[PDB]
Design a protein around this ligand. Structure first.
Ligand SMILES: *[C@@H]1O[C@H](CO)[C@@H](O[C@@H]2O[C@H](CO)[C@@H](O[C@H]3O[C@H](CO[C@H]4O[C@H](CO)[C@@H](O)[C@H](O)[C@@H]4O)[C@@H](O)[C@H](O[C@H]4O[C@H](CO)[C@@H](O)[C@H](O)[C@@H]4O)[C@@H]3O)[C@H](O)[C@H]2NC(C)=O)[C@H](O)[C@H]1NC(C)=O
Ligand SMILES: *[C@@H]1O[C@H](CO[C@@H]2O[C@@H](C)[C@@H](O)[C@@H](O)[C@@H]2O)[C@@H](O[C@@H]2O[C@H](CO)[C@@H](O)[C@H](O)[C@H]2NC(C)=O)[C@H](O)[C@H]1NC(C)=O
Ligand SMILES: *[C@@H]1O[C@H](CO)[C@@H](O[C@@H]2O[C@H](CO)[C@@H](O)[C@H](O)[C@H]2NC(C)=O)[C@H](O)[C@H]1NC(C)=O
Ligand SMILES: *[C@@H]1O[C@H](CO)[C@@H](O[C@@H]2O[C@H](CO)[C@@H](O)[C@H](O)[C@H]2NC(C)=O)[C@H](O)[C@H]1NC(C)=O
Ligand SMILES: *[C@@H]1O[C@H](CO)[C@@H](O)[C@H](O)[C@H]1NC(C)=O
Ligand SMILES: O=c1cc(CO)occ1O
Ligand SMILES: [Zn+2]
Length: 446
């Protein structure tokens, strides 16, 4: 979403988000660290290429041509500075000059020490309770964003973790068209298309970046969850990590885990999609989780088996036409889990990433809420581990990532919605260690 600095009446009608870094000649003096050699407020490049015929409503919703319905110039940082005001570094660099390289390691959560496990859990929990220093979320569309008075912007403060949740909600939210008009849903800016892996890779990056600063711990790393063991049960649903089932309500988490205290954001879509609002920062319900508890749907009562991961890494084309959730022989679609581990599609298969989400039979299984269950974070580091391995074996062959006629949101150089500063899918399409400053301690089947 947007820097608080740009969440103003001033900045919203400038069409400009170029906040100051260190201004010692007053406001306006250091927009993008430009006094130093660091960045320069210039106009945003958006992808303009056409999307799939699937999306009818070009011109009705703020996510299109991101971020151009909000901002027309952003900071473009020079070299390896990064950030909204070019104040930090691009992934894989630190130091005052962004000249010292770094490489953190994401390990399996069950290999972590006793204290490491506790500190991760306590870190997630602190991220849930701590107000994001930088981003605030819009609670209304841009049409209503400056308030009734046309002068009180309708943005709320949001916690670090809940921001993570919000950005996911806002990329899947239905397009609202008008009251009484039933909103449009064949629309997904982060799933069922090639951007699924890059959207969720940046998603993790930003949360990791955020938790790193929160903790004052530059080398904190998001551990992963190996869910491709095929077990009957959730081997990370224990009070020492993520919480086991509550003995008083088998659909809630143990009162002996902090996550039993967590309360969700964005669990009122019938409000959002009938009045044209957005998920705001107010929490309500607790997390629901019921691993393997889906009596009605036996094909989602067991996690994927180790060779499934082995096979979906045999699919050598990243994606295939129509670049949608019914793509065949498409690596993205089969890891995302609409194809079976071989590559073949069937309206009935739910494997890998998808089945992991469905297996929890609860909050983590529901698209608009699923980051509320922090298992999400580990589910996806692992999915990002499969992705990062695929790019190692196929030397990052981006040729099959389409540049046009993907579902909207999914063209190769679309800015991933609603990440800020704008970042195109292709900048996440790289081998993470040499480029994004992280790697996975992991060993693959065969
Ligand atoms: C992966 O998923 C895709 C979508 O989920 C699948 O694509 C879908 O295929 C079907 C049929 O092949 C398409 O359905 C309609 O297609 C035509 C064209 O409609 C378009 O033009 C119309 C006028 O020009 C407009 O009114 C629409 O806005 C639309 O853009 C329709 O005429 C068909 O109507 C026929 O079918 C109904 C019943 O289905 C009959 O009762 C009617 O009388 C009529 O004869 C279909 O409604 C669908 O459009 C298409 N997907 C998209 C995104 O448009 C895709 O096939 C799948 N991949 C596979 C299966 O491999
Ligand atoms: C660059 O942006 C400015 C700001 O316009 C705002 O940008 C978006 C957030 C969008 O929601 C607009 O409605 C905002 O007002 C553009 O300048 C305005 O252009 C409109 C016509 O489109 C005009 O009525 C206003 O008077 C203009 N106001 C100012 C201060 O210039 C500008 O045209 C954009 N340049 C582009 C898109 O190339
Ligand atoms: C934040 O979001 C919640 C959920 O939509 C809003 O609360 C609901 O408001 C509608 C009408 O405003 C009521 O009918 C519901 O009963 C409310 N539900 C809950 C759980 O609160 C709330 O209005 C939003 N906040 C702001 C400032 O708009
Ligand atoms: C979790 O699984 C249960 C079933 O185990 C789901 O509840 C069932 O939903 C189906 C389809 O909506 C109904 O036909 C059944 O009658 C329901 N059965 C029971 C026992 O509730 C529930 O919707 C699932 N929830 C999630 C988030 O996956
Ligand atoms: C958010 O909280 C800050 C304190 O960090 C407060 O100063 C500010 O008024 C709030 N801003 C918004 C946009 O809600
Ligand atoms: O991506 C997701 C997929 C499913 C089920 O397919 O639930 C929640 C999600 O976030
Ligand atoms: Zn998702």
């Amino acid at each position: 979403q947007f820097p608080r600095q740009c969440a103003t009446v001033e900045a919203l009608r400038s069409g400009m988000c170029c906040p100051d870094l260190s201004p010692v000649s007053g406001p306006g003096t250091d927009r993008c660290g430009s006094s130093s050699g660091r960045g320069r407020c210039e106009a945003v490049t958006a992808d303009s290429r056409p999307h799939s015929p699937q999306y009818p409503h070009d011109g009705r919703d703020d996510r299109e041509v991101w971020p151009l319905r909000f901002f027309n110039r952003t900071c473009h940082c020079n070299g390896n500075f990064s950030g909204h005001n070019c104040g930090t570094c691009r992934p894989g660099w630190r130091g005052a000059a962004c000249d010292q390289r770094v490489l953190i390691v994401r390990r399996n959560l069950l290999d972590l020490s006793k204290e490491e496990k506790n500190h991760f859990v306590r870190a997630l929990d602190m991220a849930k309770r701590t107000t994001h220093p930088l981003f605030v979320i819009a609670t209304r569309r841009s049409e209503e964003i400056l308030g009734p008075d046309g002068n009180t912007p309708q943005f709320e403060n949001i916690s670090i973790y809940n921001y993570f949740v919000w950005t996911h909600y806002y990329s899947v939210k239905k397009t609202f068209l008008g009251v009484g008009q039933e909103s449009f849903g064949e629309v997904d800016f982060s799933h069922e298309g090639p951007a699924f892996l890059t959207w969720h890779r940046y998603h993790l990056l930003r949360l990791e970046k955020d938790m790193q600063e929160m903790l004052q711990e530059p080398s904190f790393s998001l551990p992963y969850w190996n869910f491709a063991t095929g077990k009957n049960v959730c081997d990370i649903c224990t009070d020492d990590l993520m919480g086991s089932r509550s003995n008083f309500d088998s659909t809630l988490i143990s009162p002996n885990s902090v996550f039993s205290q967590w309360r969700v954001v964005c669990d009122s879509l019938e409000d959002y999609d009938t009045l044209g609002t957005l998920c705001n920062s107010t929490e309500d319900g607790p997390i629901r989780r019921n691993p393997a508890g889906n009596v009605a749907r036996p094909m989602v009562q067991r996690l994927p088996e180790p060779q499934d991961v082995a096979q979906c890494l045999e699919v050598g084309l990243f994606d295939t036409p129509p670049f949608y959730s019914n793509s065949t022989n498409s690596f993205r679609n089969t890891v995302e889990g609409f194809s079976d581990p071989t590559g073949k599609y069937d309206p009935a298969v739910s494997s890998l990433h998808n089945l992991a989400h469905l297996f929890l039979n609860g909050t983590g299984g529901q698209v608009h809420l699923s980051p509320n269950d922090p298992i999400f974070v580990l589910l996806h580091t692992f999915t990002d581990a499969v992705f990062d391995e695929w790019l190692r074996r196929y030397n990052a062959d981006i040729s099959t990532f389409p540049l046009e006629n993907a579902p909207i949101g999914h063209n190769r150089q679309y800015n991933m919605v609603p990440f800020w500063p704008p970042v195109t899918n292709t900048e996440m399409f790289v081998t993470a260690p040499d480029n994004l400053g992280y790697t996975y301690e992991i060993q693959w089947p065969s």
